[PDB]
Enzyme design. Structure first.
Site, PDB file in Angstrom:
ATOM      1  CG  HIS A  52      -2.094  -0.975   1.022  1.00 34.17           C
ATOM      2  ND1 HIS A  52      -3.119  -0.494   0.429  1.00 34.17           N
ATOM      3  CD2 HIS A  52      -2.410  -1.852   1.777  1.00 34.17           C
ATOM      4  CE1 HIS A  52      -4.050  -1.264   0.401  1.00 34.17           C
ATOM      5  NE2 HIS A  52      -3.837  -2.204   1.264  1.00 34.17           N
TER       6      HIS A  52
HETATM    7 ZN    ZN Z   1      -5.107  -6.024   3.506  1.00 33.73          ZN
END
Ligand code: ZN
Ligand code: K
Ligand code: K
Lengths: 49, 98, 370, 37, 53, 237
Positions: free
Chosen positions: C137
């Site tokens: 992320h």
């Molecule tokens: Zn996740």
């Protein structure tokens, strides 16, 4: 008194003995864990070289 | 599969030695009905509940000890049967329906 | 003479000791737990456990910016009263806190991932594991969603020195947006992610997000809904991947093995089990390609430990007994004390027609390929 | 409930670090052994 | 040679760590066994006194 | 679901104890190397000894974290300064203090393990049961006669609409199946138990309902009358 009092004594020693058995059961498992960890570390260092 | 779980599972010996294993249905607040199939035990339990020997919580917990999580539909049976009775009431009172 | 090939396995004994925040869902501690089982199943005799070479600044700025890495390398939890501009700019402070040893943690993760890439480049292995990696992320300019340095990008760059095509499969319940943004406009890396698309984090991943520029048709999104089970997941997973392997034809795979897609997780909302989750790993492995398997999510640590242990023993080619041997964290695994994670009776929302529709759409898109 | 909101705090004070008299003693010992230089 | 020296030192350290770990476990268990014996002796004595009273 | 949340709180407390103990033991593992170097060198070197800024290990953050936890962050700078400056005096003291703190924490953890065990067993089994409590309501609003007749009428109206669309619409809207012939005898058993042990109707009503159910079930489903006798009593006094 060789009577109900002795029954109370024996139901107390039951508690004590299960405690002792649990402790001596913990110990051997922990020593097995330690043995595993250290054999791991040894082989790991050799391979890293 | 309910019976294949009731009679064909074996605890983890390591957690038996250390005194960690506790199975439910060995602790329930009452005892479980005994039979040849699970289904019979389920029926006896619904019957006990309908009588009053068993509360709602104990009945659900017994159903969980028996079947697991695939027996939630049966948590309402009492209510359901109640409603069915109501239907018969009307059908027992319609004069032309006879 | 050199016999079979074993699985390389990267582990650094300090990695368990880093602590994000008071009640933070992310606990690096979990990797410690995994290892304590790999040791006590005597698995380590079928692996090659390697210590990672911590990665430096000139290795992390192959993807990130000098200012971001500099801020990482300079900040400390005490002297962050002087960095208040940098907190705003770099998205650090609430979900991605600043803690003790932040930079050392990031170096351990990235070093494991780059080491795995070098292992495959060299020929010493065909599978390589690193459970501390897989922080998918993290953007090039910012931190986002529990991740700080996106090591899958660095692994991929190091892989692209000798392999012409790379495939990145993502089965964390979220969208792997950093690893998509990095390789969005290129046709040398194809990303494929399965995720819960709705009022959900990060908010991206729409089925019509399939790349721009040269990377048109080289991103794949599979937006699912709540409570999906093992057989529905298999029905939507095996066709997509079969056709990607047929038509894209990669040479090296990076498999992210997140485990918040399991039943009972703290954040995720799917309904898989240990066997349903492992089905993906076994299917991907069945193709005989160089493979990296990294960690990911996972916020119920007992489930995560058991699943990653099972998958490690399954990549190594073994078959583990279902009773847990005595280890230092036995009391996390009550009350069955078994190597198994079980699904629940939550309700599925993915009707058969929905899955058929999206599978058809995606397969047309992939037919556009070569 | 008064019980569980009590065992929460009981757990919390478990770790608690070292105590005050103890760090004082360790400090006095340190300085003493520093005098013996 | 740098590698050989580092490995030999690390093996020595491992052997000296195992000892500390084992002594730690043994001490931990001695504590509990003594505690059990003490508590049981006190329980039996207190019961004898309670019966006499 | 409150039961998943109880499990998560429990796991959080577990993790707390484990992380403190593990960090402390890693630092101890470091000091156990410098101690055994110390005890193996001449007496003059021990005075001219110094440790670099990283205390001789790879990851200083763990070590400073441990020290700040044990000694408080008001006396930690003195300890770190003396650990860097003059080790041979400061390592034994700190090492023994850390060993004592580890012992105590291990004892406390062993004490709490059992309370946590019983909490987990109380909360665990009804945590894979998300839909067990979201059903005592939906079943209600699907057992209301209003819902039943509304559903029927909507089915009929839309089927008439499809009939006027020229489409192919069948005659019956519901298709039920009854394969096992015994389950109906078991439902009769349940009925009888309820009727006897229901505190709502009067004896004669239960009697009429019992006889009617006997006849109606035996006749509709074509199941022998004799099976229904023990469960449906004729006299409720
Ligand atoms: Zn996740
Ligand atoms: K995904
Ligand atoms: K791409």
């Amino acid at each position: 008194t060789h009577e109900r009092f002795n029954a109370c004594i024996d139901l107390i020693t039951e508690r004590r003995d299960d405690r002792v058995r649990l402790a001596t059961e913990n110990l051997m498992k922990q020593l097995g864990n330690i043995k595993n960890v250290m054999d791991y570390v040894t082989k790991q260092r050799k391979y890293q070289l | 599969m309910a019976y294949s779980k009731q009679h064909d599972v074996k605890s983890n010996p390591v957690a038996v030695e250390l005194g960690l294993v506790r199975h439910p249905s060995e602790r329930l607040g009452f005892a479980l009905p005994t039979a040849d199939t699970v289904y019979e035990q389920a029926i006896q339990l619904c019957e006990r509940l309908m009588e009053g020997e068993i509360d709602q919580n104990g009945f659900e917990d017994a159903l969980r000890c028996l079947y697991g999580i695939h027996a939630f539909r049966l948590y309402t049976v009492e209510k359901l049967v109640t409603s069915i009775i109501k239907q018969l009431h009307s059908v027992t009172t319609n004069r032309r329906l006879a | 003479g050199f016999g079979k090939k074993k699985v390389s396995y990267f582990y650094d004994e300090d990695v368990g000791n880093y602590h994000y925040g008071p009640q933070h869902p992310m606990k690096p501690h979990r990797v410690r737990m995994v290892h304590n089982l790999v040791v006590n199943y005597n698995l380590y005799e079928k692996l090659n456990v390697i210590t990672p070479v911590r990665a430096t600044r000139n290795d992390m700025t192959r993807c990130h910016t000098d200012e971001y890495i500099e801020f990482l390398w300079r900040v400390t939890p005490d002297t962050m009263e002087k960095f208040q501009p940098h907190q705003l700019k770099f998205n650090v402070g609430d979900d991605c806190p600043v803690f003790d040893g932040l930079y050392e943690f990031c170096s351990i993760s990235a070093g494991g991932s780059i080491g795995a890439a070098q292992e495959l480049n060299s020929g010493n292995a065909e599978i390589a594991i690193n459970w501390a990696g897989g922080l998918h992320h993290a953007k090039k300019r910012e931190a986002s969603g529990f991740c700080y340095v996106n090591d899958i990008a660095l692994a991929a760059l190091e892989l692209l020195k000798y392999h012409q095509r790379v495939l990145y499969i993502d089965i964390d319940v979220h969208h792997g947006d950093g690893v998509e943004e990095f390789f969005y406009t290129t046709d040398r890396v194809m990303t494929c992610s399965f995720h819960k698309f709705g009022e959900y984090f990060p908010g991206t991943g729409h089925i019509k997000d399939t790349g721009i520029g040269t990377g048109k048709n080289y991103a794949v999104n599979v937006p699912l809904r709540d409570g999906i089970d093992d057989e529905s997941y298999e029905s939507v997973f095996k066709p997509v991947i079969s056709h990607i392997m047929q038509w894209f034809r990669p040479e090296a795979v990076i498999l992210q093995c997140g485990t918040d897609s399991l039943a009972g997780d703290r954040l995720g909302c799917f309904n898989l089990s240990m066997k349903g989750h492992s089905m993906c790993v076994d299917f991907v492995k069945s193709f005989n390609l160089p493979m990296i398997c990294v960690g990911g999510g996972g916020y119920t640590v007992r489930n995560v430990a058991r699943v990653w242990t099972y998958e490690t023993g399954l990549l190594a080619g073994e078959e583990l007994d279902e009773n847990l041997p005595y280890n230092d964290y036995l009391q996390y695994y009550g009350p069955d004390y078994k190597l198994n994670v079980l699904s629940n009776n939550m309700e599925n929302h993915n009707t058969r027609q929905y899955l058929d529709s999206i599978t058809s759409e995606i397969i047309e898109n992939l037919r556009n390929l070569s | 409930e008064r019980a569980e909101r009590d065992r929460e705090k009981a757990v919390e004070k478990g770790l608690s670090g070292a105590t005050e008299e103890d760090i004082q003693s360790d400090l006095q010992l340190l300085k003493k052994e520093l005098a013996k230089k | 040679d740098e590698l050989r020296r580092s490995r030999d030192e690390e093996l020595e350290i491992a052997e000296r760590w195992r000892t500390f770990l084992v002594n730690r476990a043994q001490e931990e268990y001695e504590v509990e066994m003594k505690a059990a014996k003490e508590e049981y002796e006190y329980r039996c004595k207190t019961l004898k006194e309670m019966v006499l009273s | 679901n409150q039961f998943e949340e109880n499990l998560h709180k429990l796991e959080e407390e577990r993790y707390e104890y484990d992380r403190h103990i593990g960090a402390n033991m890693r630092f101890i593992e470091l000091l156990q190397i410098h101690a055994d170097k110390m005890l193996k060198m001449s007496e003059v070197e021990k005075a001219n000894w110094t440790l670099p800024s990283n205390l001789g290990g790879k990851s200083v953050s763990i070590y400073h974290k441990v020290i700040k936890k044990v000694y408080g962050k008001e006396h930690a700078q003195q300890i770190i300064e003396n650990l860097q400056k003059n080790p041979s005096v400061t390592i034994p003291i700190v090492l023994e203090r850390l060993k004592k703190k580890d012992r105590e924490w291990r004892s406390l953890q062993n004490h709490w393990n059992e309370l946590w065990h019983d909490i987990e067993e109380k909360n665990f089994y009804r945590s894979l049961d998300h839909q067990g409590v979201s059903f005592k309501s939906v079943d209600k609003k699907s057992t209301t006669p209003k819902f039943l007749i509304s559903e029927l009428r909507n089915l009929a109206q839309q089927q008439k609409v499809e009939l006027s669309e020229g489409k192919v619409t069948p005659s019956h809207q519901f298709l039920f199946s009854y394969k096992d012939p015994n389950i109906i005898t078991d439902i009769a058993r349940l009925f009888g138990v309820f009727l006897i042990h229901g505190s709502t109707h009067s004896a004669e009503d239960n009697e009429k309902m019992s006889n009617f159910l006997r006849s109606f079930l035996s006749l509709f489903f074509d199941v022998p009358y004799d099976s229904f006798i023990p469960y449906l009593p004729t006299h409720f006094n």
